[PDB]
Write a protein that binds this ligand. Structure first.
Ligand SMILES: CC(=O)c1cc(=O)[nH]c(=O)n1[C@@H]1O[C@H](COP(=O)(O)O)[C@@H](O)[C@H]1O
Ligand SMILES: CC(=O)c1cc(=O)[nH]c(=O)n1[C@@H]1O[C@H](COP(=O)(O)O)[C@@H](O)[C@H]1O
Lengths: 257, 256
């Protein structure tokens, strides 16, 4: 039988990062991840502060921040702790294991030092996960595997998706879920996060495709919606975030019965 | 089979591909150094010393502890002096709207200094359309990852065929592939092959190695990409020369 987020947080094989997430989702009545796709640190932080109470997670693309510093990420962590959300760097690691370990720990971004969660493509084989684990496990972090993509012509289908699920289930000490369009694992210890979400039908001019929160959470059985432009391009980002939160949360409840 | 110099003149050749092919012929090198280091000073010292031996220097900018745009300016100076291209191995792999910003912007401003970048094809062709919005105006080229060297790679069969079709349909920007072998029969595309060492072996995190003779001679690729085989050696110049000579002779042999 289908379990609430709060009960899933207690499952025997739950990862600590997933448990923390699931608990705050239930506490705050939110399964919304804000995709904070902005180029200005000040806007990132103003969004994180104002929308923090409405979100379970803030997803970053640190490599698009024109004025990235590690101090910016310190300020973001303060907001994450204050408002209770996880930080997810959407880095899409996708190289051989030896390379991704350095890309995760080092360089200018030092992603592992501030990101609760990262994601990885499965195309290199399981070495990508083993490499990331060498950094992530000691730093008490989690990882999401990209099992499906939202964009037109995605090759993350069929056997590829099945491979991502197997890879996750075999690295459960580090991998806590998926980026996917629907439920892809039957194991309730895994999170499903779905991008390509807007209230209205449509897409963008570079292959993005949208589905609604009701469709993704209610019909397709995903856990969390990831929303960027549907919120960020709106005049009132707070009201937009609230609309998305209420949509995703009610769809979750209804599926739960 | 056409020489690199003849391929540089093909009707449908991309200007970046042509520049590369001409300097490969001129310098007798089809070696790409994978400069997998964390210090700018080591990067630049390798680029200067090994520049005459290489057709290309591949970077992972996001592992450089002391990256600045001025470091990349110095690398360009070396690239112009010694005549090699700069390839940032970023493996763009997101939706089109996102990758365009990751390519043009942020701290790294990759498009401002990288002649070549690469991309995974898993998102569908929007990844290439997004990149080309930035890269076409900046006269850049791109490589699509058709195959990977690592154990368990899913870049096989229909996935590889999709990479080839995507390249062939974006030939104004895509100049070739990262692959383990020749994957396109069209001589205007370059094939660059990582997972290369002289000796048999691998690493502890899924990397698998094949020799330059195997990759260039038997598998029909154009360029070898070599990191640790050179970088971990005491004398990196002599190591680079060993790889250069291996790859170049394998190419000549195939050419007949
Ligand atoms: C989250 C993720 O891994 C990813 C995968 C994918 O298939 N689709 C997608 O849009 N994304 C990302 O989500 C965000 C979608 O933003 P949008 O709502 O279209 O403005 C972007 O920041 C994408 O880079
Ligand atoms: C170049 C490329 O796209 C790539 C793809 C791949 O399938 N295998 C691979 O090793 N690479 C990269 O080449 C280099 C190989 O370095 P190595 O010679 O194993 O020390 C690394 O910097 C990898 O990130």
């Amino acid at each position: 039988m289908e379990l609430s987020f709060g009960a899933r947080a207690e499952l025997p094989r739950i990862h600590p990062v997933a448990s923390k997430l699931l608990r705050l989702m239930q506490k705050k009545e939110t399964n919304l991840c804000l995709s904070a796709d902005v180029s200005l640190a000040r806007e990132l932080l103003q969004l994180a502060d104002a929308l923090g109470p409405s979100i379970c997670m803030l997803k970053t693309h640190v490599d698009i921040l024109n004025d990235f510093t590690l101090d910016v990420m310190k300020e973001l962590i303060t907001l994450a702790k204050c408002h209770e959300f996880l930080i997810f760097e959407d880095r899409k690691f996708a190289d051989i294991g030896n390379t991704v370990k350095k890309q995760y720990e080092g360089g200018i971004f030092k992603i592992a030092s501030w990101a609760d969660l990262v994601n990885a493509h499965v195309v290199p084989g399981s070495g990508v996960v083993k490499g990331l684990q060498e950094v992530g496990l000691p730093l008490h972090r989690g990882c999401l595997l990209i099992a499906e993509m939202s964009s037109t012509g995605s090759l993350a289908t069929g056997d590829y998706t099945r491979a991502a699920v197997r890879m996750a289930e075999e690295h459960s000490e580090f991998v806590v879920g998926f980026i996917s369009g629907s439920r892809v694992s039957m194991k309730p210890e895994f999170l499903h996060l779905t991008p390509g979400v807007q209230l209205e039908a449509g897409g963008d001019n570079l292959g993005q495709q949208y589905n609604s929160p009701q469709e993704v959470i209610g019909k397709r059985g995903s856990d969390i919606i990831i929303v960027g432009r549907g919120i960020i391009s709106a005049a009132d980002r707070l009201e937009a975030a609230e609309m998305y939160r209420k949509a995703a949360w009610e769809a979750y409840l209804s599926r739960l019965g």
